[PDB]
Amino acid sequence: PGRGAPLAKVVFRDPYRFKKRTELFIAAEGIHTGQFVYCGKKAQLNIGNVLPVGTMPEGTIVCCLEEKPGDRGKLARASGNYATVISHNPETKKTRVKLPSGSKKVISSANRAVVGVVAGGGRIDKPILKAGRAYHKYKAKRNCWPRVR
Amino acid sequence: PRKIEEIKDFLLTARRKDAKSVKIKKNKDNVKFKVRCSRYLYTLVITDKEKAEKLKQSLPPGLAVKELK
Amino acid sequence: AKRTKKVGIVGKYGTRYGASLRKMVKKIEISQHAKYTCSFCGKTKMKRRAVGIWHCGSCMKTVAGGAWTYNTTSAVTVKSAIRRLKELKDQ
Amino acid sequence: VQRLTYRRRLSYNTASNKTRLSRTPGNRIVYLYTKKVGKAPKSACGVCPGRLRGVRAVRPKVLMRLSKTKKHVSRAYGGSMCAKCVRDRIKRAFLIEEQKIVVKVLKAQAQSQK
Amino acid sequence: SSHKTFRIKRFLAKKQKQNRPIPQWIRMKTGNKIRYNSKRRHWRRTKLGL
RNA sequence: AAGCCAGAGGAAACUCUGGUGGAGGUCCGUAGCGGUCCUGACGUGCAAAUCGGUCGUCCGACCUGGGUAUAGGGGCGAAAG
RNA sequence: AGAUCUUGGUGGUAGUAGCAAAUAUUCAAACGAGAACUUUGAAGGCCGAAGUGGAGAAGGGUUCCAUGUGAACAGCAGUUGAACAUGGGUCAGUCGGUCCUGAGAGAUGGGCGAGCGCCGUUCCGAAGGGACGGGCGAUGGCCUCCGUUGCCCUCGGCCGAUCGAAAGGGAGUCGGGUUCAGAUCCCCGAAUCCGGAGUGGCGGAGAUGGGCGCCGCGAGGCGUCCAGUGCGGUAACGCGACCGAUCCCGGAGAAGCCGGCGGGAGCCCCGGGGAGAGUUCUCUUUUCUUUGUGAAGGGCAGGGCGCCCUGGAAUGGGUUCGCCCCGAGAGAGGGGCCCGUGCCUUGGAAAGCGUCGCGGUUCCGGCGGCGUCCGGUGAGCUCUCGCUGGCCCUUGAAAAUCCGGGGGAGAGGGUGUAAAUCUCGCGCCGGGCCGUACCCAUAUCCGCAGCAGGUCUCCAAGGUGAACAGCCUCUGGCAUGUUGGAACAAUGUAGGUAAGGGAAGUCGGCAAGCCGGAUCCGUAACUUCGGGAUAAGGAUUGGCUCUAAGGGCUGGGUCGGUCGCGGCCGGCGCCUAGCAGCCGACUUAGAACUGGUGCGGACCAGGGGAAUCCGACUGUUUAAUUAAAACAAAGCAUCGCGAAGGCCCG
Ligand SMILES: [Mg+2]
Ligand SMILES: [Mg+2]
Ligand SMILES: [Mg+2]
Ligand SMILES: [Mg+2]
Ligand SMILES: [Mg+2]
Ligand SMILES: [Mg+2]
Ligand SMILES: [Mg+2]
Ligand SMILES: [Mg+2]
Ligand SMILES: [Mg+2]
Ligand SMILES: [Mg+2]
Ligand SMILES: [Mg+2]
Ligand SMILES: [Mg+2]
Ligand SMILES: [Mg+2]
Ligand SMILES: [Mg+2]
Ligand SMILES: [Mg+2]
Ligand SMILES: [Mg+2]
Ligand SMILES: [Mg+2]
Ligand SMILES: [Mg+2]
Ligand SMILES: [Mg+2]
Ligand SMILES: [Mg+2]
Ligand SMILES: [Mg+2]
Ligand SMILES: [Mg+2]
Ligand SMILES: [Mg+2]
Ligand SMILES: [Mg+2]
Ligand SMILES: [Mg+2]
Ligand SMILES: [Mg+2]
Ligand SMILES: [Mg+2]
Ligand SMILES: [Mg+2]
Ligand SMILES: [Mg+2]
Ligand SMILES: [Mg+2]
Ligand SMILES: [Mg+2]
Ligand SMILES: [Mg+2]
Ligand SMILES: [Mg+2]
Ligand SMILES: [Mg+2]
Ligand SMILES: [Mg+2]
Ligand SMILES: [Mg+2]
Ligand SMILES: [Mg+2]
Ligand SMILES: [Mg+2]
Ligand SMILES: [Mg+2]
Ligand SMILES: [Mg+2]
Ligand SMILES: [Mg+2]
Ligand SMILES: [Mg+2]
Ligand SMILES: [Zn+2]
Ligand SMILES: [Zn+2]
């Protein structure tokens, strides 16, 4: 509720103790239930896989990008959005990417991201058509909607 | 309440240690023997009358034999 | 018998909201409420559950797709591009 | 006709205040306060939407006083997973272990040359 | 209400017990200067503190 | 309203007719909520804002209990200070 | 003597205004000094199941009940009272609180702060005080052997105290009787939940079989050896139990709104059989009332299944009101599971109820007779269960709590009337604390009051009718809303009618009036093609007697060739354009006759059209003079910001 992107509940194995770890990835479009997704440096380029940007080619586009090397995903999270890996330099370990706003950002090559575009499609294409639909939209988000000039 | 099917079960149910009493009710079609145990009232329904009387005399002693009529 | 000349599915909105807005929302509503062919089980039961979530009745497979259509042209081109970049990355 | 009243002080038609009509031996209609409708377990596979068979559908705290047989089915994962997905898991485990044997044999015969 | 706490019930109990007339023999005491209970409370005229 | 069935016409594209279906900040209209007009009643009142008839809406930005949060140059305001 | 002076008292007004919202009272009697108002009876009315009825939440706090009083109060009165006085009344393991978390509130660590303190709630903490497991031991002691205790090893993230719901989550109590006032709480009777049992309460299960030698006529006994943490079904799954820890996985708790169907109950309705009443001027085999079976078990219907087996489907088929379903296994046949609130049964008739009697214990859960029966209906209404859909840029709690599975660390006995163990049957003990009366509103609450205002819910009969509308009525309730009597002037307030004219009235058709339901026709400009539209306009409408149409259940044999006036196979025959009988709702269409042309006869119940301005619409707004053209809105456009950030609090 409150966001237009679907969330993917993914279950991993804990590498150190006998337990199942459940994550709440942001669903890149095209992934389905019962699909295996791979996270790490040696993961392959497939929709839904998570792997560092420095290991990705010069034109790939990514879904849930890290702003800093080690936090979780921070960029291109809203539905239908993606970032693009423009360039690398192995020295200084930097990767230049293009954000949904059109800006260019230099980040560490160790930042992870999900391959593909985030699901939720062209949600802004449909006209709301109704003050009631707008009311129900913002009731799930916050008290901001009826805006007095 | 529990309905006892055959006479053999009713005998040892009446001979149980917690059996408070037995009531005998004569209806138009049957005779009901009602033994009051700790948890349940056990009722045995006898269609004829000679078997009912045979049970009436074969009831164990030391137990109240209340007649409901 | 044919009941409406042109409004079709947006006849529920009456005279309201403007003809161009109703025409704009008509195709989106049609694709939103359409039933697509499931690419896993082959049946025509893949329909939208919520925005971006498409669930198949038969095989109970759930897919992250577009808001109003099962997949977006953007996502299709992205998948093709990622496949090409993968096959170029390896040899 | 005879109109009815609640028998408890909860005067609202909430989810815990559901009643049914009963005719007493005194020839009068009264409310009897019913228990909520229980549910059978769902399958631990998380895929097929039907609920399990052979397990009595009661409220969760009623299961404490049910016997063991009433709460499971005589089968592996019985009372926790459906038979169809148990068969699928048996086949999947066997075939994937066979595949592991196949790939081990394949690399063993492949490494026979320098 | 019918649902009440023990403290509230005790408070109402004390109010009931002290809402009563004076004894008749009080007015015969030496130097009484008391004619009637001037702290009498009626449930409809004046309401309690709680 | 979409969806669906049948009949008919078409080379096709498709069209026409009769049903079915039951959408909608849809219409009339109770309860509820509101308060247009009579500039009615009352105006030392039943009432420090009420009453009668007439009215607006009545599946939704709907009505409402209780529990919580926001406190004075502060709050809260689909906005009238 | 003044200050609209302060406090207190008192006049005229003035026996005046007034005691006029919600139809309504009358007769007789009783008590009593006293009766328009009290009580009883009779009559006439009202609320009319969306109540003026029956019960709760909040709030009140004794107003509840009985008795007595007649000072004051109940704006008349009172013999009455929610007044006054004196007594009395609220009984729980299973009804709630209590427990859980929700939005949130809030300590500690830390940080800040002159300071009282406040920030923060996982963040800058050495934040686990627990554990069946193993060892060291103290033998504490019935020192067999199991219970104690201290230390060590091993395991152990609720990662955060605590509070937060008498409508959310939350195990398990029902039937009858009983009081002046209490009852799901007392009594009687039927159950049930949780916890406990160390010395183990009883059974049952585990679990008590095969092999070899011998003895023994056989059966059966002896010794040895070996098994034995259950069994059945192809399956779904079943059987009464059915060893098992840390740990892991899952389920239940645990989910919106709306639509359409179907099952079940309660109520309603219809036809009979009783029992008691009512009518009887005439008729009426008549009209009215009444005509039970709790929880919890067992059995069986019925409903549901996205459960199984056989088999393999196009000339596609199955199927719904709609849908929808099928080589990823349709149709068909045979099964399995779940729910079972319905029926039968134990409860259970002994109780209850209705009638007819008989005894008395001033006031008997008295005693007795009889009965408590058979059927039919349905787009009926209300609950409930289920199935299947639709809507969402809306996806509709959490946690206590309980359970299943995976794994197999371990434990158990040497073949014994055996062991560990047991979610099986029965048995034994306990369940503390607090609330519980009554009102719940035109008189027990708030509004200064017995104030036409305000205040959250549950149940819901008959007729008419589309209807929870309005109008009439039954069950239940009441006395007309803080007085009565007599009159019937003006002026009023509320309601009607009015010849001829028809807005000439007025700022202005303000107010009133017209229209109105249903059926059959017929409907324009304009339009965003959806609408306008009930456009506009016209016809019909009663009563009575008929006539058609729209359904459901059964059974269709050609027969003794024979004996289980009847049954198995078969020589033995052609409803196959379907008949025969029975039962049953409403609804529609048509016709005749008919009345002083009257018929949606009350009730219910749009006046219409042509344009201009503004706002798109729906929505909101100055509680108490402005509901609008104002605000909002979708749509459009612009701006800031990539987090060391934009905007904002502090
Ligand atoms: Mg605006
Ligand atoms: Mg019953
Ligand atoms: Mg008051
Ligand atoms: Mg509407
Ligand atoms: Mg309307
Ligand atoms: Mg006025
Ligand atoms: Mg101004
Ligand atoms: Mg003076
Ligand atoms: Mg002077
Ligand atoms: Mg006067
Ligand atoms: Mg007057
Ligand atoms: Mg009436
Ligand atoms: Mg009431
Ligand atoms: Mg009283
Ligand atoms: Mg008086
Ligand atoms: Mg008093
Ligand atoms: Mg910890
Ligand atoms: Mg608490
Ligand atoms: Mg509750
Ligand atoms: Mg009472
Ligand atoms: Mg019965
Ligand atoms: Mg089949
Ligand atoms: Mg009897
Ligand atoms: Mg009470
Ligand atoms: Mg009032
Ligand atoms: Mg006050
Ligand atoms: Mg009054
Ligand atoms: Mg009157
Ligand atoms: Mg009067
Ligand atoms: Mg005239
Ligand atoms: Mg005239
Ligand atoms: Mg004029
Ligand atoms: Mg003039
Ligand atoms: Mg007018
Ligand atoms: Mg018009
Ligand atoms: Mg006629
Ligand atoms: Mg407007
Ligand atoms: Mg406009
Ligand atoms: Mg308003
Ligand atoms: Mg105003
Ligand atoms: Mg106004
Ligand atoms: Mg515009
Ligand atoms: Zn599929
Ligand atoms: Zn499954």
Side-chain angles (χ1 to χ4, degrees):
Chain A
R3 82 168 79 229
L7 296 197
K9 188 165 296 166
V10 183
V11 166
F12 288 87
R13 265 182 63 224
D14 202 280
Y16 308 111
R17 57 185 58 82
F18 187 63
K19 203 185 288 186
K20 289 286 208 234
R21 299 299 195 184
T22 293
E23 320 281 340
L24 203 51
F25 286 6
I26 293 176
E29 184 174 359
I31 73 165
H32 58 89
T33 57
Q35 185 200 351
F36 294 132
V37 287
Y38 300 79
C39 299
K41 165 150 89 78
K42 304 295 195 53
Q44 311 168 3
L45 288 174
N46 289 99
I47 306 299
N49 290 8
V50 186
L51 72 164
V53 288
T55 55
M56 282 192 248
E58 306 278 352
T60 184
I61 68 168
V62 289
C63 176
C64 201
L65 186 48
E66 297 180 350
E67 190 151 33
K68 285 288 161 50
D71 68 350
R72 331 288 200 91
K74 300 279 161 163
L75 320 170
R77 292 162 55 89
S79 71
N81 282 113
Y82 59 92
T84 309
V85 172
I86 299 160
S87 80
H88 300 287
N89 54 333
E91 66 274 15
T92 68
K93 292 181 180 180
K94 287 308 168 166
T95 295
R96 185 177 179 180
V97 300
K98 183 178 179 180
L99 296 172
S101 48
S103 70
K104 309 294 180 67
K105 214 185 169 160
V106 181
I107 53 166
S108 296
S109 277
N111 294 33
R112 298 166 300 148
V114 186
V115 182
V117 295
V118 61
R123 180 180 29 95
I124 58 164
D125 297 356
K126 196 203 207 191
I128 288 167
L129 285 188
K130 281 173 59 184
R133 300 242 180 106
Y135 161 84
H136 291 301
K137 158 182 200 61
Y138 290 106
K139 177 146 169 99
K141 289 165 163 292
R142 69 205 70 78
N143 182 213
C144 65
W145 165 58
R147 191 175 182 88
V148 173
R149 286 167 298 113
Chain B
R2 289 291 181 278
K3 181 195 192 132
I4 297 289
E5 295 295 328
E6 68 270 18
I7 181 66
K8 181 62 69 178
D9 289 334
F10 182 80
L11 272 296
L12 73 164
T13 300
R15 289 192 295 270
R16 280 164 54 177
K17 203 264 163 167
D18 59 305
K20 297 179 179 67
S21 65
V22 63
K23 293 181 181 179
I24 297 144
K25 174 70 159 74
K26 293 189 287 184
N27 293 307
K28 174 187 47 145
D29 291 331
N30 45 49
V31 183
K32 302 207 189 160
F33 291 77
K34 298 179 184 181
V35 61
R36 170 75 255 176
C37 281
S38 161
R39 179 170 190 189
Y40 298 121
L41 180 74
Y42 298 89
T43 300
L44 174 70
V45 177
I46 300 299
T47 43
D48 64 341
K49 311 303 187 184
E50 53 266 53
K51 297 182 73 66
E53 183 66 27
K54 183 178 171 66
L55 176 56
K56 187 183 290 292
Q57 281 97 25
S58 69
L59 291 175
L63 181 73
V65 193
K66 177 67 182 295
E67 180 70 29
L68 294 178
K69 293 294 161 69
Chain C
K2 181 181 276 188
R3 299 179 293 244
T4 53
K5 180 179 174 187
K6 62 178 55 169
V7 294
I9 201 182
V10 297
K12 55 167 164 183
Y13 292 133
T15 66
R16 304 175 288 270
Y17 318 126
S20 73
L21 287 188
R22 293 198 315 271
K23 180 173 181 288
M24 186 181 290
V25 75
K26 169 165 177 183
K27 65 178 74 67
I28 280 163
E29 280 212 341
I30 287 180
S31 78
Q32 179 182 1
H33 299 123
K35 279 164 205 56
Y36 295 80
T37 296
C38 179
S39 77
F40 305 94
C41 74
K43 305 204 183 63
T44 302
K45 307 208 200 177
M46 172 75 68
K47 55 167 298 190
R48 213 192 74 160
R49 163 178 287 167
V51 59
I53 293 144
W54 294 81
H55 178 83
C56 184
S58 286
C59 54
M60 307 275 308
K61 196 83 66 175
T62 308
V63 193
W68 329 109
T69 71
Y70 171 67
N71 46 56
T72 46
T73 62
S74 197
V76 171
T77 60
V78 171
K79 185 179 172 65
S80 300
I82 296 300
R83 173 179 49 61
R84 208 169 333 278
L85 267 69
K86 173 164 174 269
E87 68 182 1
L88 189 148
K89 182 190 196 181
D90 65 356
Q91 274 151 28
Chain D
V1 311
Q2 198 210 309
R3 280 174 283 183
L4 296 193
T5 50
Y6 277 139
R7 306 169 66 165
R8 305 168 175 180
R9 277 182 209 275
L10 179 45
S11 72
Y12 305 105
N13 194 43
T14 63
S16 72
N17 204 26
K18 298 300 180 181
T19 47
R20 72 179 176 86
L21 268 52
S22 188
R23 182 178 268 108
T24 81
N27 196 20
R28 57 198 204 104
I29 308 296
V30 299
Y31 282 161
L32 271 185
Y33 286 82
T34 65
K35 321 278 208 273
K36 298 210 192 165
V37 169
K39 292 191 181 73
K42 289 181 72 68
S43 161
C45 61
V47 172
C48 56
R51 305 205 167 247
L52 277 74
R53 297 138 293 279
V55 183
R56 185 173 176 85
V58 288
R59 296 313 277 191
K61 286 156 93 178
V62 188
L63 296 153
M64 187 164 62
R65 65 198 190 241
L66 294 189
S67 68
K68 186 69 169 302
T69 302
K70 295 176 174 53
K71 296 178 283 195
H72 70 71
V73 167
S74 295
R75 186 178 54 244
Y77 297 84
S80 181
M81 207 160 311
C82 48
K84 180 178 74 68
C85 292
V86 174
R87 303 185 305 87
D88 287 17
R89 294 173 67 90
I90 294 158
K91 279 186 266 220
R92 177 171 283 120
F94 164 70
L95 290 163
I96 285 164
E97 300 283 348
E98 285 302 285
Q99 184 74 218
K100 293 186 194 314
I101 286 155
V102 171
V103 303
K104 186 182 287 185
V105 168
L106 185 63
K107 71 179 180 67
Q109 73 97 32
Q111 62 88 31
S112 49
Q113 181 53 255
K114 186 83 188 179
Chain E
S1 53
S2 181
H3 294 159
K4 54 178 68 77
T5 70
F6 180 72
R7 272 170 206 133
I8 292 311
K9 177 157 179 205
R10 200 175 41 162
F11 178 85
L12 301 169
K14 171 171 182 139
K15 284 296 182 296
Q16 288 186 56
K17 281 193 282 188
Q18 65 183 177
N19 187 40
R20 67 175 292 277
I22 69 163
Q24 295 295 108
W25 47 272
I26 296 294
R27 296 171 227 131
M28 296 300 317
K29 303 188 88 169
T30 294
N32 187 25
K33 297 188 291 184
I34 284 181
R35 293 180 179 90
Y36 56 92
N37 189 6
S38 83
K39 304 210 186 168
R40 287 297 300 277
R41 170 195 52 92
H42 191 247
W43 60 271
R44 218 169 194 189
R45 292 181 179 92
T46 183
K47 291 312 203 184
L48 286 164
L50 74 165

